[PDB]
Design a protein around this ligand. Structure first.
Ligand code: CL
Ligand code: CL
Ligand code: CL
Lengths: 235, 238
């Protein structure tokens, strides 16, 4: 379709899901003519696009205010993904839903958008470049990489809260099976059609379902299957 | 500020991979990041070795103004550590500068040896224009071009000799630095280089900076600091 490039797009998205830290490159406003590298944590919004919470006094915020064009570099050796994007600050109506998902990924950030001078921005894709550990270069159109999350919001929140409240034992099984860090017990942070995030201390990790899950019942089935598994199933 | 400049240089010394952002030629108006290894030159500036066919090389050729981002390694809360953004002008070294660059850089990155003109590669120095340092608590300091780098009076043949002799004669002192410090122990550490404030160990892929108790301006002062660390039961206060 071509098959390599469809594989590449999925691999790109998996890398995007598996990380929660990126290097943002922006045009320096304070120093015209210079690019500017900064670090940002992120999660994905309902449409599968990077969502950031950035401070009004941060260089990268001033830079995006003057010129929304930027790139994000995210790592897996080693596979690497570049996103070319136009950043947009979320309208007031968009903030509640951003905040709810972002604060689940980053609970120590809670209320920062209200009490401190932080705002949510979304990176709107213009192009992606995925390079595998073997060095195969795949340039991909804007819409090829993101995958919408039909759970984002209320369905997801109920799923995550029930898992953290009533199925901590199963969560321990996932960590064991995947060989994740065990300095603290894990909690679910979020769920998408392809997998789920666990937070472990500071500390985010993505795990794939054995197959895609389009509704909460399919998610239940995958999680039960994972909890009973003796090794991580593939595909 | 004085605190800030020192802490900035400390991070620069402690790291060996940075994110270089350049003006994109392929997609004008989008800055592109790439990961580059680096060490510091005799003047304390970043020295990189980049392929004639790499995109970031074509980018720097068309516009040498760039950013280099360094930050504490493996940080899970990435905004709870210091980060340093260097704004710089990249300059390809003249033929007269190449030998001293290769000799130091190849000590830091042995696996690269003679990639310059068996392979596609040339040495470039990042000439500082401005630094933006953010501390672990989130204080922002903008620093002048010359505020952060400190020259290394050992760079080249003095250093090469001190390092070669520590590695041949004092493997035992080196293993002890490793124990005292951190620090991976499967290999067998080698000294990579020495500066007035500290020294680098390679293990084995694998670079690590360790401070002297106080700056050492001459080779007699570095021997002293290295003897003290060898006999030290715990790492001393700086
Ligand atoms: Cl930063
Ligand atoms: Cl800043
Ligand atoms: Cl650009």
């Amino acid at each position: 379709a071509n098959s390599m490039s469809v594989e590449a797009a999925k691999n790109a998205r998996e890398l995007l899901l598996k990380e929660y830290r990126a290097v943002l490159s922006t045009h320096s406003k304070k120093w015209p003519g210079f690019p500017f590298g900064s670090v940002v944590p992120y999660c994905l919004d309902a449409e599968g696009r990077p969502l950031i919470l950035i401070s009004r006094i941060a260089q990268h915020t001033h830079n995006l205010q003057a010129d929304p064009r930027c790139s994000m570099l995210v790592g897996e050796a080693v596979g690497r993904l570049t996103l070319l994007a136009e950043a947009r600050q979320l309208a007031e109506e968009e903030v509640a839903a951003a905040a709810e998902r972002y604060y689940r990924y980053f609970p120590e950030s809670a209320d920062y958008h209200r009490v401190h001078d932080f705002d949510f921005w979304v990176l709107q894709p213009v192009q992606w470049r995925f390079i595998g550990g073997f060095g195969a270069i795949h340039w991909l159109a804007a819409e090829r990489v993101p995958l919408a999350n039909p759970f984002a919001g209320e369905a997801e929140r109920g799923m995550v809260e029930h898992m953290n409240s009533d199925h901590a034992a199963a969560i321990a099984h996932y960590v064991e099976l995947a060989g994740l860090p065990a300095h603290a017990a894990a909690q679910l942070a979020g769920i998408d059609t392809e997998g789920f995030h666990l937070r472990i201390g500071q500390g985010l990790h993505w795990l794939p379902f054995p197959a895609a899950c389009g509704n909460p019942g399919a998610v239940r089935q995958a999680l039960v299957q994972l909890a009973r598994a003796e090794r991580w199933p593939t595909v």
